[PDB]
Design an enzyme around this catalytic site. Structure first.
Site, short mmCIF file in Angstrom:
data_model
loop_
_atom_site.label_atom_id
_atom_site.label_comp_id
_atom_site.label_asym_id
_atom_site.label_seq_id
_atom_site.Cartn_x
_atom_site.Cartn_y
_atom_site.Cartn_z
N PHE A 72 1.43 -5.13 3.45
CA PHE A 72 0.55 -4.03 3.81
C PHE A 72 0.98 -3.52 5.17
CE2 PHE A 72 -3.38 -5.52 1.10
CZ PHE A 72 -2.64 -5.28 -0.06
N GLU A 73 1.41 -2.26 5.20
CA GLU A 73 1.83 -1.65 6.45
C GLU A 73 0.89 -0.54 6.85
OE1 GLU A 73 6.05 -0.81 6.83
OE2 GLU A 73 6.48 -2.50 5.49
N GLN A 74 0.92 -0.22 8.15
CA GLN A 74 0.01 0.73 8.79
C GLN A 74 -1.46 0.34 8.58
OE1 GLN A 74 1.22 4.88 7.76
NE2 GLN A 74 3.28 4.03 7.45
N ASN A 129 0.82 -1.21 0.00
CA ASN A 129 0.00 0.00 0.00
C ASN A 129 0.86 1.28 0.00
OD1 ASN A 129 0.63 -0.95 2.66
ND2 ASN A 129 -0.88 0.46 3.54
#
EC number: 3.2.-.-
Lengths: 302, 298
Positions: A110-112, A66
């Protein structure tokens, strides 16, 4: 345009105690990124890299992120996870990506991921597993290291729910101290222990890959709010220890190398990084807990 | 189309006996009429390195789609109007973007264009220092002036014109060669002694390797080795539980292992001990610095 650009990839270094034949390693090529409607926004010059990886008897994986221009987008992934049409669109697009381009699977990075989207993330990954395993494609995921479920920015990552639906879990066990924090060990062996202990109570051990640090850090001590530490490679840290003739010491508690020096302006610096001994201890704790692998980073100039 | 792209830069590790630094950002490349062909989003990089009291330098290459072009520099140097045009837009690049100077990285320079290359750099040192800008150059390592494929680099003439010489003292063994040390201390000493006799000592920076290599032994000519980082070599040795051995003659670490397919591998690289020996030889001959590599992905 620039034809000196480093391609980042994450690669798997199997636990040596565990080894026509099914492949024993993988390379996750960075990155493809997503749009709010679930489309894959970009394309890569990956055709040469995919073909080369296959020929070396290693699985090429597509990394799906992302990412935006200013980094990982907390909002873009949220818009996908909350629109059932969009996450179905993403699931189909990821399949279309691996089948057309010839990848052996994916790495979801996918981070955060927001804490409210925790069960929605698991559900998306279940929907992705179903689609991918039907075509024989592997599902892997990069997650941040977790020691409990009490941390808000880590709450979006259900280890037990993710571990049930993915083939492999790449645990990014580093950045306990980083550029936006107080100086200290990047991947202290004490916190790796705790991370493993929390994970092996939730996920089968052969699904677990412990990722090692990409960056060490150089902080100016008396630490100042607002200031950013210098993110440097492990070799860069050794190179700075030479230039300043600083002795490289080793924390017994943390199993992490560190040094201090004073620069040409009087300012004291503190550097924490990874050496040969610390990296050995990480493969050692992987072997101790019968885990799948150590994971690490490579840069390939093309 | 790719948010994770690694920016290569060559940075300077000063000889501690001299107690300023620089960073050469890669790259801009050249058209045969002497134009600068590409643009970089470097304004943020330039500013961040100026902030840490270190000089940013613009790297200028003869790079194309398939590597370094002999042809492109052969046409820029031979035609006087093109080479004056190059000097011009190098200066304009440095002045407008806010660089503190330049790094010429012209590779595969032909033997016939030896003195013409020296003249171009002379013509550029003039224009650059009038604006107060540094001229540096990256040269391949020479131990003599005899082998003809790299005799287009007049060490004596280049040394008199440039402010600093970055000697790329690595790849004595590489991807297309037989297994062996990337940068043995024996060939480094020979390079230094050849260089200091012709070039002022405070101008000399010796570059260290970026890659180590992994060869499958009984070596077969025609195949290519795996170009790996020095940390990648360590990581590969943990995986195959191979002991790291150190050659005393070459002052260079190495190891061997068997893979899953039964093939035997030989890996040469650089570690902490070999790196320290390189700074030691820099200090022995009172040279300026060690030059090394940074990777910034953004």
């Amino acid at each position: 345009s620039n034809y000196i650009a480093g391609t980042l990839s994450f690669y798997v270094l199997r636990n040596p105690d565990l080894d026509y034949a099914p492949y024993s390693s993988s390379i996750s090529i960075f990155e493809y990124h997503i749009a709010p409607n679930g489309d894959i926004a970009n394309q890569l010059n990956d055709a040469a890299a995919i073909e080369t990886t296959w020929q070396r008897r290693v699985t090429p994986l597509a990394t799906i992120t992302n990412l935006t221009s200013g980094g990982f987008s907390t909002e873009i992934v949220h818009q996908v996870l909350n629109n059932p049409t969009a996450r179905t669109n993403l699931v189909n697009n990821i399949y279309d990506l691996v089948s057309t381009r010839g990848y052996g699977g994916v790495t979801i990075d996918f981070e955060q991921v927001s804490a409210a989207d925790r069960d929605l993330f698991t559900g998306f990954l279940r929907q992705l597993r179903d689609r991918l395993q039907a075509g024989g494609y592997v599902l892997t995921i990069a997650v941040p290291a977790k020691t409990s479920d009490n941390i808000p920015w880590l709450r979006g990552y259900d280890y037990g729910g993710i571990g049930a639906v993915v083939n492999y879990m790449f645990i990014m066990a580093y950045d306990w101290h980083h550029a936006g924090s107080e100086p200290g060990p990047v991947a202290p062996i004490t916190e790796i222990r705790r991370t493993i202990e929390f994970t092996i109570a939730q996920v089968p051990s052969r699904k677990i890959i412990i990722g090692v640090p990409l960056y060490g850090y150089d902080w100016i001590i008396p630490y100042q709010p607002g200031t950013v530490a210098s993110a440097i490679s492990n070799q860069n840290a050794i190179e700075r220890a030479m230039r300043y003739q600083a002795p490289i010491q080793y924390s017994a508690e943390y199993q992490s190398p560190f040094f201090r020096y004073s620069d040409q302006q009087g300012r004291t610096h503190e550097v924490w990084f990874e050496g040969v001994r610390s990296m050995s201890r990480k493969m050692q704790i992987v072997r101790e807990y019968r885990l799948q692998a150590i994971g690490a980073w490579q840069l390939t100039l093309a």
